[PDB]
C-alpha cells in the first residue's frame, strides 16, 4: 500500500496538491486532489520523465515513456506511461482530480516516484489531432504548474 | 549512471541545487552542488523520510532511517541512512557541497529518490550532543530549505 504526493506550483496562479495511492503492487493507482487557479475547462495532465526542476518545468523532459510508445489517452493501449489524459477545472477554476490508472505505478519499471507531474495550459488531444505534435505531446500547450512526485506517509 | 537532482527552497533567502550521481548500483553516491543565503559555518544536511511538501518542510518527516538506527554523522557505523552530516557556508553564505557516500543509494532499499533533502539552521552535532534529541536529529534546529529528490537525465 504505497502512497505518494505531489505539490504543484508554477509561475502563474495554478497551485495544487495531488495524491497517489496504490494498495497492491500489481494494482491500479488512484490519483486525487484539488488544483486551483486554472482556467475553466480541460487541461492536459501528465507525468514527465525527469524530477528535475532546475530550469523550471522545462527541465522535466518529455512524457514519461519507458516503452517508447506514441502519445495517446489513458484508455489507449498505445500511450506513454505518463499519459493521464485531462482534468477539468470548474467555473471557479478548481479541478477536483479523480483518476484511476493501471499503467502508471508506484513501483517497478513504471514507477513515477521521483518524476514530475505537470498540469498543462490547454486540453490534451489524446493523440487524435492529426499532426506530429499530437502523437508526441497531445498539443496541451504550456506547462502551467509542476512538482516532483514524492513518497508519502 | 543513475542521476538525481534536488532544488532546495524555503521561506527565506536559503536556496540551492544539489546533484547526485551513482555510476554503479552497488557503488557510492557522489553528491555536489551549491547552497546560498546561509549563515557562515556549519549546517545540518539530511535526507528526510517523506517527499511530502504539503505542509512545507515539516511534512518531510524524520531522518530517512530504514534500518532503525540511532542518529550519527556520515562516517559513523551507527547512523540513519539519511545522515549526511554538515555542509559548510563561507563568509559570503555559500556552501559548496561535495560529498561521497556509500550508505545512501539511488536505487534499491536505501533509495533516496522521492524523499526530501533538507538543509538546517544550525550544525548537526553528529549524535554527540548528550541529550535525547542528539540521538534523533542532531539538534540542527530549523529546516531552512528543502526539495524532493528527483530522477535526473
Ligand atoms: Zn506534458
Ligand atoms: Zn504522452
Ligand atoms: Zn533534518
Ligand atoms: Zn539522523
UniProtKB/Swiss-Prot annotation, chains A, B:
N-acetylalanine modified-residue sites: 1
What effect on the protein does mutating residue 54 to R have, as reported in its record? In ALS1; reduces tendency to form fibrillar aggregates
The keyword Transmembrane is annotated on this UniProt entry: no
**What binding details are noted for the cofactor?**
Binds 1 copper ion per subunit. Binds 1 zinc ion per subunit.
Provide the residue positions that the database annotates as binding Zn(2+): 63, 71, 80, 83
Where in the chain are disulfide-linked cysteines found? 57-146
Q: What is the effect of changing residue 37 to R?
A: In ALS1; mild form; ubiquitinated by RNF19A. Ubiquitinated by MARCHF5; leading to the degradation of mitochondrial SOD1
Q: What GO molecular function annotations does the UniProt record carry, in alphabetical order?
A: copper ion binding; identical protein binding; protein homodimerization activity; protein phosphatase 2B binding; protein-folding chaperone binding; small GTPase binding; superoxide dismutase activity; zinc ion binding
Q: Record's superkingdom?
A: Eukaryota
Q: N6-acetyllysine occurs at which residues?
A: 122, 136
Instruction: Give the binding site residues for Cu cation.
Output: 46, 48, 63, 120
Q: What is the effect of changing residue 80 to R?
A: In ALS1; sporadic form; interferes with zinc binding
Per the UniProt record, the associated disease is:
Amyotrophic lateral sclerosis 1: A neurodegenerative disorder affecting upper motor neurons in the brain and lower motor neurons in the brain stem and spinal cord, resulting in fatal paralysis. Sensory abnormalities are absent. The pathologic hallmarks of the disease include pallor of the corticospinal tract due to loss of motor neurons, presence of ubiquitin-positive inclusions within surviving motor neurons, and deposition of pathologic aggregates. The etiology of amyotrophic lateral sclerosis is likely to be multifactorial, involving both genetic and environmental factors. Spastic tetraplegia and axial hypotonia, progressive: An autosomal recessive, neurologic disorder characterized by loss of motor abilities in the first year of life, after which severe, progressive spastic tetraparesis develops. Affected individuals have severe axial hypotonia, hyperekplexia, hypertonia, and myokymia, reflecting upper motor neuron involvement. Cognitive development may be affected.
Q: According to its UniProt record, which protein family does this protein belong to?
A: Belongs to the Cu-Zn superoxide dismutase family.
Role description: Destroys radicals which are normally produced within the cells and which are toxic to biological systems.
As a miscellaneous remark, the entry gives: The protein (both wild-type and ALS1 variants) has a tendency to form fibrillar aggregates in the absence of the intramolecular disulfide bond or of bound zinc ions. These aggregates may have cytotoxic effects. Zinc binding promotes dimerization and stabilizes the native form.
Query: What protein name does the entry list?
Result: Superoxide dismutase [Cu-Zn]
Q: Which organism is it from?
A: Homo sapiens
Cite the source lineage: Eukaryota, Metazoa, Chordata, Craniata, Vertebrata
Q: Which gene encodes it?
A: SOD1
Amino acid at each position: 500500500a504505497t502512497k505518494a504526493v505531489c505539490v504543484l506550483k508554477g509561475d502563474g496562479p495554478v497551485q495544487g496538491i495531488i495524491n497517489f495511492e496504490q494498495k497492491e503492487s500489481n494494482g491500479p493507482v488512484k490519483v486525487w486532489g484539488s488544483i486551483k487557479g486554472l482556467t475553466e475547462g480541460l487541461h492536459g495532465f501528465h507525468v514527465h520523465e525527469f524530477g528535475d526542476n532546475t530550469a523550471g518545468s522545462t527541465s522535466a523532459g518529455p512524457h514519461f515513456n519507458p516503452l517508447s510508445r506514441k502519445h495517446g489517452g489513458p484508455k489507449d493501449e498505445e500511450r506513454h506511461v505518463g499519459d493521464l489524459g485531462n482534468v477539468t477545472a470548474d467555473k471557479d477554476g478548481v479541478a477536483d482530480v479523480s483518476i484511476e490508472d493501471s499503467v502508471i505505478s508506484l513501483s517497478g519499471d513504471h514507477c513515477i516516484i521521483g518524476r514530475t507531474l505537470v498540469v498543462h495550459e490547454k486540453a490534451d488531444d489524446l493523440g487524435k489531432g492529426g499532426n506530429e505534435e499530437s502523437t508526441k505531446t497531445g498539443n496541451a500547450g504550456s506547462r502551467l504548474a509542476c512538482g516532483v512526485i514524492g513518497i508519502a506517509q
